[PDB]
Amino acid sequence: LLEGTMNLTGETQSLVEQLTMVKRMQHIPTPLFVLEIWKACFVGLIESPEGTEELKWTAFTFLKIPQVLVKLKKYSDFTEDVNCAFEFLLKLTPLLDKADQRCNCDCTNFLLQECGKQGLLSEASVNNLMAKRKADREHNIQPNIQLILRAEPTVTNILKTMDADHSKSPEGLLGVLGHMLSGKSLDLLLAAAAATGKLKSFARKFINLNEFTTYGSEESTKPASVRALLFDISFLMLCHVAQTYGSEVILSESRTGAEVPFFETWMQTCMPEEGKILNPDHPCFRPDSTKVESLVALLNNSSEMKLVQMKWHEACLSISAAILEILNAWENGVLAFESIQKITDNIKGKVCSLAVCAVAWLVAHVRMLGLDEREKSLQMIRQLAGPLFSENTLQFYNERVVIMNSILERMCADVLQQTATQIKFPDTMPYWNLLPPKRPIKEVLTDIFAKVLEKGWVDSRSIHIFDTLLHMGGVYWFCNNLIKELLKETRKEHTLRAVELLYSIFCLDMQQVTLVLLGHILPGLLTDSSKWHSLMDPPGTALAKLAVWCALSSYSSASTRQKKRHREDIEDYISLFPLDVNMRDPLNRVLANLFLLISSILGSRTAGPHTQFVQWFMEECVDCLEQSVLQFMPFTTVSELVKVSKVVLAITDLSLPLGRQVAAKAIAAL
Amino acid sequence: MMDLAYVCEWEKWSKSTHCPSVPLACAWSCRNLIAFTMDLRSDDQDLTRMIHILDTEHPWDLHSIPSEHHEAITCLEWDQSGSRLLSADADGQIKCWSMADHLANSWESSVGSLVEGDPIVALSWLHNGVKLALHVEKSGASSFGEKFSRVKFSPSLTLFGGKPMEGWIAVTVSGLVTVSLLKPSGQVLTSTESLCRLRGRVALADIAFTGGGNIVVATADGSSASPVQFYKVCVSVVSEKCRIDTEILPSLFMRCTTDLNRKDKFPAITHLKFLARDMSEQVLLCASSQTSSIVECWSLRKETILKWRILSATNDLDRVSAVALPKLPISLTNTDLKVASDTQFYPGLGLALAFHDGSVHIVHRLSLQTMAVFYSSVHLKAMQLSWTSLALVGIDSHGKLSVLRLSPSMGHPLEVGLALRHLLFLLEYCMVTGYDWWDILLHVQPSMVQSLVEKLHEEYTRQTAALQQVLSTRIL
Amino acid sequence: LKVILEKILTIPNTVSSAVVQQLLAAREVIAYILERNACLLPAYFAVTEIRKLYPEGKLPHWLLGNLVSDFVDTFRPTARINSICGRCSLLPVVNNSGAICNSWKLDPATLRFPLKGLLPYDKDLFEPQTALLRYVLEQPYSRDMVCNMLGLNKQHKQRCPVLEDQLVDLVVYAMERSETEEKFDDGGTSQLLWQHLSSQLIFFVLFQFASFPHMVLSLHQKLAGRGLIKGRDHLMWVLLQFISGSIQKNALADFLPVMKLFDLLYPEKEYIPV
Amino acid sequence: SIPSVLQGEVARLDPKFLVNLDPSHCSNNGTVHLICKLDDKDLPSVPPLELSVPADYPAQSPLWIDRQWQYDANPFLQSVHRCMTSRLLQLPDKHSVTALLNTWAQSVHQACLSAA
């Protein structure tokens, strides 16, 4: 559910390796694995709210997981396991009925046909299961499932034939862009591309077409209007892609030479996203001084009419300083309101991208400005985004103004929340500003953890709240509070399920949380003279299992927000771990320190619950490994464990050249 | 002559193992009292959660207060008169420690405030509203009122006349602020509020006061690529609690990132300070990378109506680990700079900086220029200066404490008369106030004791028949 | 088994380990006793004696270890057989005919369902059941029902505290409700609610199942800083019923905190118009 | 660690014995474990007869860890063992380790004399 919620665009190799790693960590039968996967997919589909999220979830659960199963087949007998898991899943009639009635179609038949296409299930078994499902069920608008399954080949065809620009025919380009500009077509194409994992080339191709079309050439009025429409539609699609599927896909991250696209620079320096705040006085916002004067003269004279060749990129860079000049003069009081109305009508008349860039710059400037002076700009901002402008449209205005309204909503709601203002641009953002404004975060964290523990499964809204809480509070606070909440359980099943849920909760960013844990929380709980009173048997065993799971999972080697978070902050790990292979990776240092501490505790005097805890740690460390984190383990603990009381030796020896004789000596003296 | 006075260390405190590093705090009171905490991790956690009280006259004996705190202590603050200590850590638990039976070796607390789960990043006492200005030009004016002039700031939260009200204000990790006020009795009134609707990480915070009874709070995320927000706060007690009114002030952006030559360096902000408390028109920023660091100063002077500009920026610095500010209230007027430059009188023009080496630097206040460099022959994590700025205390990354002698001349030779005038002018400041003079005695030479005594004797005389009546015990 | 467990409990929670191997003999004896294969004794006796020693929520000794804990987990299935599904959300219809069924009774001490045996039951059966009696109290003519399900006999003074706490919670909930809108309807199911609330309270406090000064102090504590002042006149009407009901029976002091309450609930300096 | 009494008593034993620390088991504690070897020209070889010394050795007595299978399968060795049991039942309370070692030597000698 966590993978399907956030990072639906990620490579399936990471998901496959994580699933196999989880399967190896705790012994899971294959039919139970597949049944759990299918049940998780369906329950995630059902709870999705109406909108683009339902389309994304349907695309994910009906396109992406067949490749995961195919890769499981390739890496790994599996066929009868899949059939057995399916016959388990077919017993659940109410869940299937709710999923069927939500999507207005028999989704089980489509899923069976899709998995049969991949060859996972045999034809006779497919027919028998279809007959069983129809018997169980016996007790004009096309559904989105068929739309996705029939439009993914359309996505492939469009990606294939667009490279040649349809034999350089602009009219056909307008026709095909208008065809995909109809109801929900863009969202279906984007979801199919994301599920198929081919959106990168799609964005690359649109960026190349935009770079070709911005400069343009000499044309008469009709082809010039064609060029302007191409530029506007490409800009709208790129902006929608940026605001819907993050900032990672459009950016190339691999570009040779100084001929970088201008849209990439605008993306990096001009659009306010959830993780970036712009500087209005950045050097990129001060290109020149004559181009902006030409642009403001054109704006205040009449309709531009010069769009045959206009240098769209330089003009777009110029609206920032232009609108700066108009707003400064307007605040000076030398310009009337009707002049501003005429300027906004000129901006919103023919080309709509200029309004978008002006609104973005206005938001960036307003963010820095003080409370008593911000109200002046918002009225002209909402005038820029007022009702639809008629008697000036070329064609294809409906979805254009819809996508513009959505883009400006997702760009301006952040500042609209700060003040008491509402513009009502007419949901597209159900997960936004969820936590209460005044109460402390510990209360909501504990309440949500208790609710998740009681229910037995994690919801997507809870995932988003956990993500924002982790962003606000920090890794140490989050882990310490969650572990402190863990140690209040007196029942073995409750703490077992708590650890099982907490592993997936910590799977948000495994490296940082395991580093913080193994470097700060376990040594602190193990060294203090008054803390092992809470290290009793059920919570101690559960915490030891969680710790060893996290340690070896991180040794075996997940969000943009956490990516910027751990790229933001540095930490001198050499000073943190003086330490009495590489010795530069912090995981190696912290694990060596932990092993030194565990050896010292085991060999110490006046043993109590902590020695039982370290015995459990060693026991589950031996149990979990296939043969590997025991390379850093000291050689004395081999004899120490025998002293404190076989297979718990040979696996731990690691067959070192010193290991052979130390193991022989240890096992000989039993 | 920048020198080392004495190094104090404790046996068995060192040789810690499996101890992650933890930040420390230090506090110097009006009397020569030091309150701090040190990283020990020696066979018990509580040794890292104890308050160490030291008296400079007897460094060898130290007092330990076993504070009942559950997390690492963040900040320590003294009162305007050094009779109470404010301590705060993560997970709330703000405590007010009071002196027991008027003994400095016994402390007990009965007043506190608590917010659950939110670590406190900023904490400060309320303002009383009295400050002075010192003029070095009029050091021979032969008049106490002429030398130390009243500045007449206004106090905050005045009730029933001109008597201020006492209390404290704290800022948590999130956009949350708490205010506590103390009744003349044991009653305490507490309230909490949210800064603004924009709730995000506040890694660094600072608090200052302004004339008129307003509080300026500065918040920094710490990413070096986001603006530093400023807010204004007013506290009013409407008959049952202290309500807080907050509004937004213009922000700024970091420098050394638009240079377009090498901007990837210095990716994190590590220190945000106010140049002086009750002086909210200057803000010091210190950013650092894994190797180098940069320190800059900004001001809100009038040329939007209010804008932040750049004053100075050092060439290149190593990793910054500790910064300390002066406490002497210099008048800072134009006519005083020339007479404080021709005469070697630098008691309030220095900012103290420490690095990850054994190097300690004294840098000029208005323009960031180095004037004094000290090498220890390890690095300093927490440090403080004095009211007269004649000495600084420092805590290294070990069990050692250091006290360093700072001289006004800073190596420049001077005649006897100028030194005598400097010493008597500094002593008269402690004469007017109730502060001690141990750091002043650290620098007096044995040869010129008689001249100082006699000249102070005639300084005692020829007063306007009232100063002599209340300064006999102090003059003796 | 009882004596061996009680003797092992006397060992300190932290002891040396040079002797623990000499101390594990008691663990071996208990391991032999708690084995369900050799059938030394029925397992029901072993689990009930362990639960008699260790109530729920208390951790076992650090020397016994998992050996005890896993044992009670093996009695998890049987406890599921003797549990009614959805017990917490069952609600009856209140009548004055009497003849109470035994299925609706509650624990007078802590408001819990009487459970048969010491089996490791479900978690939801160990929290107080505040919803059932909250619903029962809210209904009109629910006078004998409450005393019957709480075990009260209305012939002997008892001074039951949880009843006072529930009454205070009901009054503050009614105050919040009267604070909510009171504008859509002139009545708004308020005046009858206040009359019933007031009427039932007069009955509970007259038989001395609750204490007046304690209730007033508790109400002041609950309303301290809550800022719910829109229907304070009704609460003052209820307090008038309080004081005028039994002024002659008791002393003046029993009414001392009302003064603080009047001041708190009425922060004003200007005159109140008629 | 090792108390001074044990070190002194080991320093002041007859050179027939070369007792030393047990390679196995715990060390540097109140309870120590020793393994014994007998080197007497007039006596044969016997099992090591290891001992355990509790904490605060004065004013108490040590105990001998019996190993029945080691002394079995030979009439000579089990005769030694039964004489050993008899002598240790004849030893009084508060005895030392040197007395037990001398008892071991004398029991071996008596068994050898009885055999031949």
Swiss-Prot record, chain A:
<comment type="similarity">
    <text>Belongs to the Mediator complex subunit 24 family.</text>
</comment>
<dbReference type="GO" id="GO:0060261">
    <property type="term" value="P:positive regulation of transcription initiation by RNA polymerase II"/>
</dbReference>
<dbReference type="GO" id="GO:0016592">
    <property type="term" value="C:mediator complex"/>
</dbReference>
<protein>
    <recommendedName>
        <fullName>Mediator of RNA polymerase II transcription subunit 24</fullName>
    </recommendedName>
</protein>
<dbReference type="GO" id="GO:0005634">
    <property type="term" value="C:nucleus"/>
</dbReference>
<dbReference type="GO" id="GO:0045893">
    <property type="term" value="P:positive regulation of DNA-templated transcription"/>
</dbReference>
<keyword id="KW-0010">Activator</keyword>
<keyword id="KW-0804">Transcription</keyword>
<dbReference type="GO" id="GO:0046966">
    <property type="term" value="F:nuclear thyroid hormone receptor binding"/>
</dbReference>
<comment type="function">
    <text>Component of the Mediator complex, a coactivator involved in the regulated transcription of nearly all RNA polymerase II-dependent genes. Mediator functions as a bridge to convey information from gene-specific regulatory proteins to the basal RNA polymerase II transcription machinery. Mediator is recruited to promoters by direct interactions with regulatory proteins and serves as a scaffold for the assembly of a functional preinitiation complex with RNA polymerase II and the general transcription factors.</text>
</comment>
<keyword id="KW-0597">Phosphoprotein</keyword>
<feature type="short sequence motif" description="LXXLL motif 3">
    <location>
        <begin position="186"/>
        <end position="190"/>
    </location>
</feature>
UniProtKB/Swiss-Prot annotation, chain B:
<dbReference type="GO" id="GO:0042809">
    <property type="term" value="F:nuclear vitamin D receptor binding"/>
</dbReference>
<dbReference type="GO" id="GO:0046966">
    <property type="term" value="F:nuclear thyroid hormone receptor binding"/>
</dbReference>
<dbReference type="GO" id="GO:0016592">
    <property type="term" value="C:mediator complex"/>
</dbReference>
<feature type="repeat" description="WD 9">
    <location>
        <begin position="410"/>
        <end position="444"/>
    </location>
</feature>
<dbReference type="GO" id="GO:0005654">
    <property type="term" value="C:nucleoplasm"/>
</dbReference>
<feature type="repeat" description="WD 1">
    <location>
        <begin position="10"/>
        <end position="60"/>
    </location>
</feature>
<feature type="repeat" description="WD 8">
    <location>
        <begin position="378"/>
        <end position="409"/>
    </location>
</feature>
<dbReference type="GO" id="GO:0070847">
    <property type="term" value="C:core mediator complex"/>
</dbReference>
<dbReference type="GO" id="GO:0051123">
    <property type="term" value="P:RNA polymerase II preinitiation complex assembly"/>
</dbReference>
<feature type="repeat" description="WD 3">
    <location>
        <begin position="109"/>
        <end position="154"/>
    </location>
</feature>
<comment type="similarity">
    <text>Belongs to the Mediator complex subunit 16 family.</text>
</comment>
<keyword id="KW-0539">Nucleus</keyword>
UniProtKB/Swiss-Prot annotation, chain C:
<comment type="function">
    <text>Required for transcriptional activation subsequent to the assembly of the pre-initiation complex. Component of the Mediator complex, a coactivator involved in the regulated transcription of nearly all RNA polymerase II-dependent genes. Mediator functions as a bridge to convey information from gene-specific regulatory proteins to the basal RNA polymerase II transcription machinery.</text>
</comment>
<comment type="similarity">
    <text>Belongs to the Mediator complex subunit 23 family.</text>
</comment>
<comment type="subunit">
    <text>Interacts with ELK1. Component of the Mediator complex, which is composed of MED1, MED4, MED6, MED7, MED8, MED9, MED10, MED11, MED12, MED13, MED13L, MED14, MED15, MED16, MED17, MED18, MED19, MED20, MED21, MED22, MED23, MED24, MED25, MED26, MED27, MED29, MED30, MED31, CCNC, CDK8 and CDC2L6/CDK11. The MED12, MED13, CCNC and CDK8 subunits form a distinct module termed the CDK8 module. Mediator containing the CDK8 module is less active than Mediator lacking this module in supporting transcriptional activation.</text>
</comment>
<protein>
    <recommendedName>
        <fullName>Mediator of RNA polymerase II transcription subunit 23</fullName>
    </recommendedName>
</protein>
From Swiss-Prot, chain D:
<comment type="similarity">
    <text>Belongs to the Mediator complex subunit 15 family.</text>
</comment>
<comment type="function">
    <text>Component of the Mediator complex, a coactivator involved in the regulated transcription of nearly all RNA polymerase II-dependent genes. Mediator functions as a bridge to convey information from gene-specific regulatory proteins to the basal RNA polymerase II transcription machinery. Mediator is recruited to promoters by direct interactions with regulatory proteins and serves as a scaffold for the assembly of a functional preinitiation complex with RNA polymerase II and the general transcription factors. Required for cholesterol-dependent gene regulation.</text>
</comment>
<protein>
    <recommendedName>
        <fullName>Mediator of RNA polymerase II transcription subunit 15</fullName>
    </recommendedName>
</protein>
<comment type="subunit">
    <text>Component of the Mediator complex, which is composed of MED1, MED4, MED6, MED7, MED8, MED9, MED10, MED11, MED12, MED13, MED13L, MED14, MED15, MED16, MED17, MED18, MED19, MED20, MED21, MED22, MED23, MED24, MED25, MED26, MED27, MED29, MED30, MED31, CCNC, CDK8 and CDC2L6/CDK11. The MED12, MED13, CCNC and CDK8 subunits form a distinct module termed the CDK8 module. Mediator containing the CDK8 module is less active than Mediator lacking this module in supporting transcriptional activation.</text>
</comment>
